[model samples]
Target: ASTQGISEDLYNRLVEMATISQAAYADLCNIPSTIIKGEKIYNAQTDINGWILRDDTSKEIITVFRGTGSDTNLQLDTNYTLTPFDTLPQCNDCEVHGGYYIGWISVQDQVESLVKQQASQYPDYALTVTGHSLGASMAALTAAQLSATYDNVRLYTFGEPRSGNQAFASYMNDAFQVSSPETTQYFRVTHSNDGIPNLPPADEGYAHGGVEYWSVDPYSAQNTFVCTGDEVQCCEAQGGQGVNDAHTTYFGMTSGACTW
Candidate 1:
């Protein structure tokens, strides 16, 4: 009943977690109402937004980052200059997207402090980070930063773009042990024809990290592909172009569906 260490139920839950990042809080129909210990984290100067929540039911300390919501966020998206990722100094050559790195920096202190406290309180709980679009980029950076201190870190990003270069991708693969046959720790979920994932263009030196979970049909869990590497022919064949419906929806839920 599971594929690549992700069960149907866990897949749905991760999708929900990604979806709820677009909201101010976890009030989505797919998310349980009872499991609600969440705090909204934002930076007005950088326009970075997300939430850190604890899910008692799953024994997870979840951190969710919101996608682009303003021109400032768009500016961050277009600031494609690959900057040094100082957080993971182990990889001396590791570099990440300029904007995404800044976004992560904007809220890193708050996220780290809260996550540390939560982890201390529940040492056995899993630490999961997820998001969509620009938020996905933040999630990638956040996960990489946290992995330095936490061994139970797992990442699930939806419509994530190339956050770094080849070296960074290799570092991520090794850090997460993506090649291990035991279990999949990182899930880079990309939907069919979602143009966001294809950017900021591989030709420009951007590359994806971790294992890709591509869904030809985002509405159905059955039609999914677990790609072997950071970039695969399975998703490349679809031609990631244009920000269309496929980019806005995942698992039958629209990104940023909640209005408050």
Candidate 2:
């Protein structure tokens, strides 16, 4: 239904994805209809909060990103404030969805569940997972959980840096993939100067060499990341740069850069 570079079918599909995403987001917010327009729908600043993570579905492609931090060593399977979403009831600072824990405990799961739901509804599309900063961390965790269920799982991250140390790397790699068998079993979009998630010969961040930032801002969108994976010289080319209790939402984001 799509042409080489553009098509109405693709556009429509993207709209479908957007509507589904918004619905799912509302459901996760746990806002009562009685409190939000006597219905479930919400409008970001007005009702609950609405952030449409739109993508060029002209390709049936999606990416997921997770957030990570110094605390908790950012384990792959371990449950933490960053597992799915972060929750900070006392803290006032919130971004994207909220602190990682809040998004993890409340929102991320719903997004994962929707992925499956859509598979049954639209069986002819492909999907991917990606992220930036701490979001990259969340995308990684969400991928591990969803990969087994979805056939077309692909992940791309920017400045995912590293959440855990060497000990966590082995476990995280195992969870990511046991072997490389596909053009994109999974690829990491890291940057050298990005300086947060360092690569090879570095100890402060994570380095697996398996991760390759294959394309330079291939997404071609503003607020996009500088990937060392896509281009080993991203930071040398351009430069950077998350949150309180912000550790949890590091799992699966509800919108752009990292959702399928």
Candidate 3:
């Protein structure tokens, strides 16, 4: 089984959290038996969904945002522009999606409030950010801003579309210093045939940042790759019918995660 940085168990639990609806959030009172045991700290949604949990075993705070599930989200996806992330340092020239830009802007203050308060409450716990699809983009933006005040931040986005241009990726890659598993880093995961990772189209000046964890056969546990380059070996061509199905099969769930 090829795995690095985050273990398979951590990835599965995060994906499961993403699958549950906002309504089922109440059930998250119970944490999974595997991996670091953590209690749900905060869960909220306003045009997007995100939650924060404190992993007691690892002494880390895990923050995760959920991807699109509504018609509103679909409209935003098409509204593309290489908008600047001027608010963050060293990333002022970074251009991300207008949709994803607003998505994080709306929640950044609130997310900062909760995370700062939590960090003050527990100074020892580190931070890890994660999400799938649109949530992936938002997570990247949020982590970038949070990095201004926080250290040891880890970002892991699944089936993530292009969040920004080459500049954005460069800034994020450096900020995270994502050379290996031990430091703060970005993990952009692509499952085989999942076309969401190819979204916004590279032709549009959009690009994905971070090292890729490609699961060739997501249904199985071993056929995975820690791909540093060569995206084609991990991604198939898009603009067809099966892409929707492919995007939702991150772990081969019977039901798709992204509705649009």
Candidate 4:
């Protein structure tokens, strides 16, 4: 219900999309209208952590990273150290959480190569990067690193944790604006009690991106509140108790309750 650009329908769609994008890793790639059909146009050979999809009908390219899956991914979640956001080669000042930075760096070359190859074919298509939880961190980094070169890039992540500190977040916000100015470009969606968004713990000097659309009801975007400034003003201000593990919560069955 936000006139500030993010409507309920739009929020729900993007959240659903971010969730569905995970299917790429699972090879369950049947997407919606004008989207990629089955695994026909999907590519994940460059890396085991993600997949690439191209939708020519909508002139859109989607780069998706898989969330925590193996034990290594789980270990990265607990590595709470900070490192320079150096994946871009150009950004040496912004400090990002170490684990997240490493995850992005590991797959950066593959993602860049795939996106570049696709961009050459569909020069007019917009590229959207997405992921959930840990993958969300990598997706955000991909968007930031590719933003300067790709003006048509957009980002969508669910249950996304803090990718970096305030400086890095600000740098991303600027990059996201290059393509979509009047509307949201780097959209970070969260849910009530989704503890994933609350950590690497904000108190530890981590920060999130702008325009969070938080839904109180699990996976429902109806009656959602929009926070263009600080997330605490709307999303986190709401309670997060048993839903703390809501970290696993996402559209459809993506939230299958996980204890960790």
Candidate 5:
């Protein structure tokens, strides 16, 4: 793991409350489909996908673009892997499901610690990072860590596979996240098949764990409130795609979704 700082209890409380806050935020905007419908896709639409969302009001919405979610939606290579980042590695190959970098709790501490320690320097400002497949792998590990350390950390991930095995996921959820008052708020967005989200060795997070598993409607649309993804789809056409751009035609509410 990266390192430890802060009590699990504090993070647990944060998780419970944060989940509610995150749900409210996500319930309002499903970006996957929203962005695709936007005209940006015709223009090479690069900046829209694989990142966090912020609205006109400057609120940090969800955490996406990293870890298992990235690996899955993007159809990244998990069969044989490599680290895509130069940041920090909580564990070697920890980015994937079975890469032996399973200690996500470590990176979790790191990201949250940085956000909490540094975010106050910029008032009314929010911080967000993203990845795909491996990025999603990192993001999931990072979410819990961030939640424990930062009070304002919000994660909205897409195509995120089960982080740990069924046991780990269930244990963590029942132990603190779902049962206790964990502050870690995770919104796992997923579509159909999406072999990548669950491939590449990791047994955990492979079967299921998408709290907001969306196959149609909300999840299909892309986020556009902040120009995060497709502009027309998220706005005009009503939906876009996320991860690898293979998703539904609608997600979240048409009005007040993530600012693209």
Candidate 6:
């Protein structure tokens, strides 16, 4: 069955893809071994980690960003000052989390080059950007940047924090047509009581992008709710439950679990 333009099987695969980021490179390549082409991308200076791969069966160019794993990333997470998103000139008033933007910038060149190469090789393939936790924020900015060039870009972020201000969120919603009934390009997946999504706080001017898919339980496709607006009653009503257990787990799997 399908919900909000995504099939249950695809959702499960995306969850597995998100989990792959947390594992070692060798392990990532072997898990689900259908990846015809894959490469690891990282910026040692910023401690940003991620991977880009092509799923042979699905014909998708997938870009996966890993969540926080070091003190450097943790520090970046706390640098929540909002700054103008200069990369996308269309959103003049748009501003995003300073730290998240930096994370994207650090790996922007490599991601662009690799994604472009893959896109050219598989012109018919779709582009998917995804991640969990802090990686989710990076995925948001990365997807936003990629959208400028690739029209087929789809984003799936789990436990994503508010990455930008209201204007930025509006820009994303409009660009992806998140409110449209005919198409769904963005899926900000939030599990029950995951407080990370509530971070950088709404009071600080940070706001979420639209097309949310809130799961009542981990990995339960049948229990998910599709919330189209930025602050819909579905997930927003639950409020912040604190990031303890809920934040680390998605789809009943630990995000950074390296063991295959």
Q: What number of clashing residue pairs does each candidate have, in the order they appear?
A: 0, 55, 0, 0, 94, 1
Rank order by lDDT, top first? 6, 1, 4, 3, 2, 5
lDDT of 3: 0.66
Residue 164 in candidate 3, Cα distance off native in Å: 0.4
RMSD of 5: 13.7
For all predicted structures, in order, the TM-scores are 0.89, 0.44, 0.79, 0.83, 0.42, 0.89
lDDT, candidate 2, 100-143, per-residue tens: 33334443445555565545555675565555554555555455
Compute the lDDT for candidate 5.
0.35
Model 2's lDDT to the true fold? 0.37
Worst 10 residues of 2 by lDDT: 37-46
lDDT of 4: 0.68
Pairing residues by index, what is the TM-score of model 2? 0.44
Candidate 3 residue lDDT tens string, 1-260: 23434567746654554443221223333344433423342323335666766766667777766566666666566677777787775785778888877677777777888788779988887787877677677788888888878887877777788888988888888888766545537877777777777777778888777877766653443565666643554553434222476676566542232331
Model 4: per-residue Cα lDDT over 22-112, one tens digit each: 5644654445556663123222332337667777776788877777766777777787788887556555468887877767766677678
Give the range where candidate 6 is weakest over 10 consecutive residues by summed lDDT: 21-30
By TM-score, the better pick of 2 and 3 is 3
Residues 200-231, model 5: lDDT tens digits: 33322333332342333233223112111212
Off by over 4 Å in 3: 1-46, 180-184, 230-232, 236-243, 254-260
Alpha carbon deviation, residue 164, candidate 1 (Å): 0.4
